[PDB]
Each structure stands twice: as structure tokens, then as C-alpha cells.
Point group: C6
């Protein structure tokens, strides 16, 4: 159950991701790095977890991370692997897994009108599947308009950059 | 016994929470974050634990956190998962569990900009389970603070809690403060 | 390693004392400071009583894992205290004397040439006994008269059944150790 | 998880590359700085060769525990680097491509408007093979032209069989990755 | 073998101790605490380790700390339990164990002509014996005359203070 | 095979050591301590490991530290036991083991007071064993330094080693430095 979901004809293993920023803080003295507190959502299909909600009498199943396969996401430009706590893993009748964690990380994206800081994400490859990262924009957001002391957030989006991918989450900021 | 309690009917599982602040301290140089030392109370009903106080020969039963289901609470805007020590888990004859922990956390709630007052926040959520709908409530008798001083330079005007929805439900503990 | 049963109907009284070795490292905001001390606990466990005459010993030594020991939590500390057991020794009547050396960062802000800092202690509840914290003033003391740089200690005492009581379930029991200090 | 045997008499060549993601946190004495990068290693293990036509795959993925992997040690770092494996993937001919993301505090002091910082790599010896470090310049690069605040990167390359060689037994093999920088 | 040595008629379990100071350093900004690097010697009799060096053909046996009983020494006024590495455990034919460790500790002994800083030692009690701390002055010393930057060492001795004891190692210092 | 090698005769076990300095750095604010990054070489004979290079089909054998006896070296004047990673253990046909580690340590050797020169020290000892007398020696071909700069402000004049007795035997690695 903890190997990758077996191929489905006609679709890759797409993993949809979103980051919702809760707080950015603690820009260091050189403005090279800063901490981020956020939620990371991931979503993908695992047909082995599909169920009939009519006969089963349920509409959503909850799992513990140890009981199922979960893509391994790596933030590229962070000081250390992020510090994460799983909040929710829930599966729909068709086998869509919705995974939610709260994380903390020190993002390495130096500050140089406005500019663009980056959080880059990749996923670890597996041999039975091609895992592809995508962005679900409904799950991408921010708690407010202030980056941290001195700087506003103009926008926060994500871009699929150069089967595989890397995600480039873009935080556009400007001086107050 | 470490799965969620089953319902009496189709009532959701209400978890009553309270935070009693012991100390706030160590505001950082940017006034973005500060430490909190406090008690967190949780209360909920687990009918499987119900007992007759006269057949059992005790009026309250004490449990160890591994021996019973306990809602998993996550503070949202903290640097790391809080550092907690369980103080007391005790169960009433009707199955009401009262849980008390003492915890420590660095709250991420930046101080402001023209006004002398402000509201800081501690947000709580609870992990979902599939056999019940879990609902956070506030028990105001278990909400308080040791004193009127937030930390050096700032008074506490009030400490209360409110329910708000998820930004995509949650408790918003509001600490209203003002310059001394 | 369950709690001792009663020698009748009596609550389980746990006498405590704190002997301060050193306070130091007041932080820049004078909010917190480190304390190095001994903590003494004493309580009766009849299951450990013994006849010293027949056994030929007047004290038995135990290892913390081998016996029940009350779980004390300091309330206003940054992290659970860092403790090393020094001595657990049992008298013929079952009186256990427990000694630990501990370290902790106490959260008790300095405000006003005269003030009272606090170390609050509670004990975890058990269901077979009512546990009650008491103070043994013979085991309460301090190495000297200096709190830390800049401040004298006027007195160190403890206050039993304090009315500070926050919550009626951490009302297993609470002690308020009071350090009264003044500017040098 | 022993070293691959020869496809004859050839040494075991391990091609390396470093792709710099970020350098940051130059210390107050400008003696040390943090580096966040990818490290690529590539080498042949015939025991992992496979027929892609019969098996229907063109790449196999492995977990670090399941295969032999050369043990690379950065010489002038404060502590062994902090690494997370990102990808291990094997081609039909047995070529293993290993990718890790790492962090390390590099000890390479800034002195003079122009200078060369170093990251030295060696590999641990094994007795069944002679291990030789090479540089794959296609896997050597940098995210941008700024070293860190105050300094540009002019170039990032590596130098093979360096004559820096300290000891003739850490002469399994040594690479000298050279970061040439200048004041902005 | 790892319980305490059985009583010997007519002597307690005396543990002789010595501290040889290698370096004192890193007096903190309030002059409340400072680090110490030193050797701690301990010596005591364990008759179960007595051997005949003639028939055995040896004059000293070496042991690993796990294989024998060793008194548990606690420094009282230190920030954390000392950080120790065993250097040597060697036993003589009559069962005298000589134990040597190198240690590091942050000593809590605030600086107030000359004064006296203290390192206090106790030993954990055991029920089959009365363990008594003593001072072996041949094993008490210092690498040099300078305490740390600004202060000389006048003397370093130890005193047995108020079966049981606590040792008070006394470092008398004065301004340069 | 993880007890000490037995003697050829009654010769003590000579352990040849060398330290090759890679970098010194991070002199503290009091100039009492500094970090060192270096190689430590140890060499000694273990006749049980001797082999015929023609029957064995290798000329040097490689070992893992758990599989053979290795002298335990302790640096005396360091804040904590050094932090070491083994790089190479290799054995010659005659049983000569060459061991190489890269290590890190905070050396406690305070800088001075009228003179522009000084000697800093790194002291090494070896743990005793009962079946052999272990004797530390210096192999000067394995002693060196990457360059002429100690750290910011100070040149290295020389780096050598000397035997001295125990203060109640030991190697005294002497780093002679002078102001730039
Ligand atoms: Cl990560
Ligand atoms: Cl939390
Ligand atoms: Cl505690
Ligand atoms: Cl490394
Ligand atoms: Cl200690
Ligand atoms: Cl060491
Ligand atoms: Hg943000
Ligand atoms: Hg507060
Ligand atoms: Hg004190
Ligand atoms: Hg860089
Ligand atoms: Hg000293
Ligand atoms: Hg050096
Ligand atoms: Na999993
Ligand atoms: Na539980
Ligand atoms: Na116990
Ligand atoms: Na491996
Ligand atoms: Na032992
Ligand atoms: Na070994």
C-alpha cells in the first residue's frame, strides 16, 4: 500500500500542489533568507483507495501518513528540509487523496519598486511511475498583503518550469 | 479504545478548549514573534469511558494519554509545533474527559501602526477523523491570564476566543494589548 | 510503580523543598533567568516499609524506575526542568526521601526596588489517591544572599494551597515558591 | 552493496558535478559561508545493467540502501554536509546517476578585489577497486552571478587530479571546485 | 559485577578524587559562570577485581566502564551534567581501581585582591555501602598560574565538607 | 580481532601520528579558543592482518573501523571530543595499518603578552590497553598545513610536534604563529 499507485491508463501521476502562506518573518541581517510558515496541500489519485460511498456508507476516508503512499516533496532553496506536521489526509470515493501539512522553513531567496522571491519545489522520482508536479491555484494563497516588516506582497502564484517538473512559487513584493 | 468516540446519535464531537496564559515573553527584535507559556484545556464526551461511581469505587478516573483517544490540536501560527507536557486527564462518571496540558510555543503574530492598541492571535485547529465530525468550541471559564501585563512595554486589555472559518473552522484566541 | 495505597483514608502528602544553588543568566528583558537547585520530595509508601532490626539496614536505596514517584511539573518554566536524580532513600516506616538536582529557565519577570519572583509547582493527578503538596521548610533554602548580579535575596519561602489557583483540575495541588529580592 | 566489479581492468570513474543553488551567511570574519547545492555523481555498476526492451523500462529507480554508492567527503567544511537524496536512477548499461541536495558551511576564507574560494572533495577508498573522481562539466553550474551580498561570481569550475594533494592515501582521489569571485 | 563492591571489614567505600585543571575559559558577560576543561581521577577498592600478578603474569588490568562498578559523581554547581570521556580505567593486584576521565563543564561560581571560586562534588548513594568522598592531593593540580584572561590562580585545593560528604574544590584567584 | 595486536616480541606498540591542518578559524572574542579542521593520520603494525599480496590478489586491503582494532586517541585541550569522520583505513602486506580521519575541534589554547610571536598547542594522548604498552610517535611526513595563514591577523611560522610527559606521555603539536 506504500508503493506508488499503479498507473491509470491515460493519466500520469499528477500531484497538484498549493501553498497557503500564514506568515513570513525573521528576514536575516543580510536579507538573504527569511522564515515561512504555511500550509502545503498535495492532491493525487490512488485507485487502490477508491471506495463505494453508498455501500460503505461514507463520503470521505481519513488515513495516517504511514498507511499510504505519499509523494516526497523537497523544497530546493531552503536552509534545512522543512519542518512539517501533517494536518489532514483524506480520500474521496474516486481515490483522490487530499493531503494537508503545516510547515516551517527558512527560504533562501535574497532580496535584491518590486521584486520576486522564489520557493522551488521538486518531487522524488519513483520507477513505476512518472510523477509530475502541477499547481492548483485554488489552493495557493496568502493570509495578507504584508510580506514582512517593510514590504508588501503584490502577488503569490506558482509556475511550472523545466516526465517531471519543478514548481516555482513566486512571491512578488515591493517596498512600503 | 484509541479510535474516536462513537456518537450518542448524529451529534458532532464538540471539543471545548481553553487557554490560560501563564507568561508571555521574549518578543523578538522585529516584534514579529513572542513566546507563550500557558495551559491548554480540552473537554469532550467519550461514552465508552462512562462509569458508575458507586460500582467503581472512584468518582473521577485518571488516564494516561496513550490509553485513550485525545483530539489532536494544532496551533496554526507558531514557529514549531508547541512543546507540551500533559498535566491531567480525568474522566467523569458520564464520560466527560477533561484534559490539561502546559505548553510552550513561539507565536507568530507581528505587532503593528498609528494606533496604541492591537489584537494578537493564536489560531487553533483540530485534525479531522472520518467516523466523527469534530467541532471546536470555547469554554470561557477555562480562558484567562495570570495578569494584566503582556510583556515589557504592553498591557493586556483582554484575552478571549472566537470561532472563524478555515482560510482556504478554527478557534481564534485574541489577545488585545496596548502600550503602557 | 502504581501510587501507594492508603495507611487508611489519609491523602498522599508530598513534602517538597527547594534548595537554591545558583540563579544566573537574567535575559536582556529581565523576563527570565536560570536556576540551579535541589528539589526534595518526601512521602510515605507503606509497601516499602521494612524491619531494620531483622534486615540489618536502616535505609534502603532505590532507583527511580523501581518505585512510584510523584510527577512534579514546574508551571512557569521555559521547558520541563532538566533533572538528575541524586538520592532516593526509604526509611523503615516507608517514608521515601527523593533528591534531584535540576536546572530550569524560570519565567518570572522583574518589574520596584523590592520584588517577589515565583516558581510554581504542581503535581500530576492519580485516580487511586488524592495527592497533596506540602512544604518542608527545613529543606527550603539558598546557598547565599545574592540573587544574581545587581540583586540581593531577602528571603526564599513557599506558600501552600495558593489562591493563585488557575484551574480546578491542576488542583491536584499547587505550591508557590517565592523569592523576594531587592536592588543592591 | 559492495563496490561494482570491473567491466575488465578499468578504474571506477565517478563523475561529479555541483550545481550551486545559494551561498549565504558569510560569518563576521569572512572565514566561512553556507552553501546550498546539488551534488551529482555518476558511475557504472554492471550488476545493475538491464534490457530495457524486454523489461519495458528505460530507467530504474533505487533507494540508497539498496545499492553501492561512493562515499564522498567534503574536506574543508565545518561538519559533514547535510544531504538529502533526491534521485538515484540507473540506465540500461548500468550507469548510475545519483542526485543529492546538500547544505554545508564551507571553510574557505576571503582574504584581493578578485579571489578564488575552494570546495575540496575526496572519496573513500575500497580495496576491490581503484576509485577515481572526475568532473562532468555539464553538471557543474550555478543559479546566478551573485556569490552573496557584496560579491559577484566570475566562474565556478572544478579541477581534477589537483596537486594540492595533502596525503598519498586520501589519494583515492581529490577534486577542487573553484569559485572565483570579485567585489561588486 | 556492576553492583557496588561488597564491604571490606574495617574500611568504608572511600573514593579518592582529584581534579587536574587543563584550561579555564569563556567567563560570561556577567562573570557568573565559566567553562572548565580538566581531568577527574577517582580511586577506590573493589576486591572482586583483585588478582595475583605472579600467577596471572600481569601487574595492571584495564577495563571498560560498562564492565565494572564506577561511583556516580555529580558536580553540584554546573549548568549541565559534565561532558566526560573516559581515558583510563586500570586495576592493581589488590583491587585498587584508578579511573581517569577528561571532562568539560560550565561551572556556576560567580566572581565577586583575591577570591575563591568553587566546584562542589557529591556522589550518588547506594544501599549496600556507605560511599565516602576523599581528596587525593597528589592528583589535584593545574596546568598553570593563569585562571583566565585577567586573573591569576593563587592555589587550587579541595576540602571535605559536611556516611557521606561533599567535596569543595577551591580555586583561589586574584586580579592581574 | 578487535583486541590490540600481540607483539612480535616485547616491542611496545608504536603509533605514528600526523596532523595536516586544513583550516583554522573562528577565534573567539577572548582569543582563548579557535576551531581547527584537519586530517589525523595514525599508523601502527598489526601482524594478524599481514597477507601475501600474490596469494590474496590485492596489494592493499581496506577495512571498516568496526572490523579492526584502532588506537583510541584523545585530544586533551579541546572543548568536546573531536568530531571525526574516517576517510581511509588501509593495510599493507606486512600488517602496517594506515588510518586517516578528517576532524573538527575547538582547541583550547589561548593567545597571549609583549611579544609578537606565540606557540599554540594541541595535546594528544592514547588510551592504555593491558596487553600492550602503546607509544605515540610523530611521523613528520604526515605533519603539515595547507598554508601560511593561521587565521585572520596571524601567520603560521611552523607546525611541528614533540613528545612530552603526562602532567600528573603525550604528543604536543605546536603551532607557532605571529602577528601580520
Ligand atoms: Cl523540504
Ligand atoms: Cl502545535
Ligand atoms: Cl518541570
Ligand atoms: Cl561531507
Ligand atoms: Cl556532573
Ligand atoms: Cl578528541
Ligand atoms: Hg508571507
Ligand atoms: Hg501573557
Ligand atoms: Hg538563587
Ligand atoms: Hg553560490
Ligand atoms: Hg584553569
Ligand atoms: Hg590552520
Ligand atoms: Na506514507
Ligand atoms: Na491518545
Ligand atoms: Na518511578
Ligand atoms: Na548504499
Ligand atoms: Na560501569
Ligand atoms: Na575498531
Amino acid at each position: 500500500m506504500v508503493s506508488p499507485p499503479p498507473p491509470i491508463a491515460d493519466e500520469p501521476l499528477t500531484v497538484n500542489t498549493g501553498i497557503y502562506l500564514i506568515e513570513c518573518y525573521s528576514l536575516d541581517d543580510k536579507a538573504e533568507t527569511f522564515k515561512v510558515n504555511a500550509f502545503l496541500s498535495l492532491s493525487w489519485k490512488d485507485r487502490r483507495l477508491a471506495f463505494d460511498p453508498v455501500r460503505s456508507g461514507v463520503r470521505v476516508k481519513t488515513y495516517e501518513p504511514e498507511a499510504i503512499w505519499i509523494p516526497e516533496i523537497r523544497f530546493v532553496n531552503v536552509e534545512n528540509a522543512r519542518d512539517a506536521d501533517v494536518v489532514d489526509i483524506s480520500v474521496s470515493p474516486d481515490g483522490t487523496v487530499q493531503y494537508l501539512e503545516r510547515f516551517s522553513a527558512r527560504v533562501l531567496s535574497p532580496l535584491d519598486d518590486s521584486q520576486t522571491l522564489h520557493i522551488y519545489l521538486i518531487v522524488r522520482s519513483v520507477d513505476t511511475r512518472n510523477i509530475v508536479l502541477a499547481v492548483d491555484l485554488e489552493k495557493v494563497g496568502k493570509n495578507d498583503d504584508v510580506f514582512l516588516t517593510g514590504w508588501d506582497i503584490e502577488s503569490f502564484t506558482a509556475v511550472v518550469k523545466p516526465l517531471e517538473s519543478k514548481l516555482d512559487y513566486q512571491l512578488r513584493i515591493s517596498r512600503q
